Curated annotation (Swiss-Prot):
Function field: Confers resistance to the different beta-lactams antibiotics (penicillin, cephalosporin and carbapenem) via the hydrolysis of the beta-lactam ring. Does not confer resistance to the polymixin colistin or the fluoroquinolone ciprofloxacin.
The organism of origin for this protein: Klebsiella pneumoniae
Cofactor notes: Binds 2 Zn(2+) ions per subunit.
Keywords: Antibiotic resistance, Hydrolase, Metal-binding, Periplasm, Plasmid, Signal, Zinc
Domain of life: Bacteria
GO MF term list: beta-lactamase activity; zinc ion binding
Essential cofactor(s): Zn(2+)
Self-association state and partner proteins as the record states: Monomer.
Family: Belongs to the metallo-beta-lactamase superfamily. Class-B beta-lactamase family.
Enzyme class at the top of the EC tree: hydrolase
Activity control note: Inhibits by captopril, thiorphan, dimercaprol and tiopronin. This enzyme is not susceptible to inactivation by the beta-lactamase-blocking agents clavulanic acid.
Lineage: Bacteria, Pseudomonadati, Pseudomonadota, Gammaproteobacteria, Enterobacterales
Catalytic activity reported: a beta-lactam + H2O = a substituted beta-amino acid
Protein name according to UniProt: Metallo-beta-lactamase type 2
């Protein structure tokens, strides 16, 4: 199931979808895994989230070249923290068009991140304004409200049972909501439930720091966030 490729791990989730996993030593927390996605859409590849670092992200591109061998048309990154945007320079060095929530791009410099080239904006109901996400193919981008961060976004993969919650969603056995340093504790619970409601048929919930889980990940994350109120 898991394919080790250098210091990264890749796991196929569906015929056209793989999870990428990279690791960073956090003093006091061990070597922390972070997950993103790789999607083949016909003759091109779409990426959700970088790895923690430029070098790791270049290795994702190397894995794509060896295992898929199609151009990477774009990447979308799901908030302005290192696990999701730390490898932006590697995407730009490779010539890949990059997208993030406008707010993520605004926050990127102060977070020590490099902004994506393009900014996504969202309707009042949370769905991305399609003009800002051209050529996204099966990627359906949804802003659920502030939670893990104020800028966190989520992605469903049309034609699959997969939805990606990023750092907003924790697994059904998680003991905490993780890093709340930039979290909106008041709105977290509602944002988690809004993610589930935006992707009601998604049976495989992919997230940043745990293996894919059932929809119980959503209901359990929302119960834990209730305590922050
Ligand atoms: C323990 C911990 C602390 C953190 O402090 C930060 O400032 C940013 C992150 C990355 P995050 O997972 O929040 O996107 C972070 C991650 C972990 C595990
Ligand atoms: Zn984060
Ligand atoms: Zn995280």
């Amino acid at each position: 199931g898991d394919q080790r490729f250098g210091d990264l791990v890749f796991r196929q989730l569906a015929p056209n979808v793989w999870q990428h996993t990279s690791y960073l030593d956090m003093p006091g927390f061990g070597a922390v895994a972070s997950n993103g996605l790789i999607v083949r859409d016909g003759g091109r590849v779409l990426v959700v989230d970088t790895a923690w670092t430029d070098d790791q992200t270049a290795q994702i591109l190397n894995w794509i070249k060896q295992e898929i061998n199609l151009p990477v048309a774009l990447a979308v990154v799901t908030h302005a923290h290192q696990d999701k945007m730390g490898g932006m320079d590697a995407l730009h060095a490779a010539g890949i068009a990059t997208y993030a929530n406008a707010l993520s791009n605004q926050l990127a410099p102060q977070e020590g991140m490099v902004a994506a080239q393009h900014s996504l904006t969202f309707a009042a109901n949370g769905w991305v304004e399609p003009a800002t996400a051209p050529n996204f193919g099966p990627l359906k981008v949804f802003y659920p409200g502030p939670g893990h961060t104020s800028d966190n976004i989520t992605v469903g993969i049309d034609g699959t049972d997969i939805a990606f919650g990023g750092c907003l969603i924790k697994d059904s056995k998680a003991k905490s909501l993780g890093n709340l340093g930039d979290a909106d504790t008041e709105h977290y619970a509602a944002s988690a439930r809004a993610f589930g409601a935006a992707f009601p048929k998604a049976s495989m919930i992919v997230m940043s720091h745990s293996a894919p889980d059932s929809r119980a990940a959503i209901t359990h994350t929302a119960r834990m966030a209730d305590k922050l109120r």
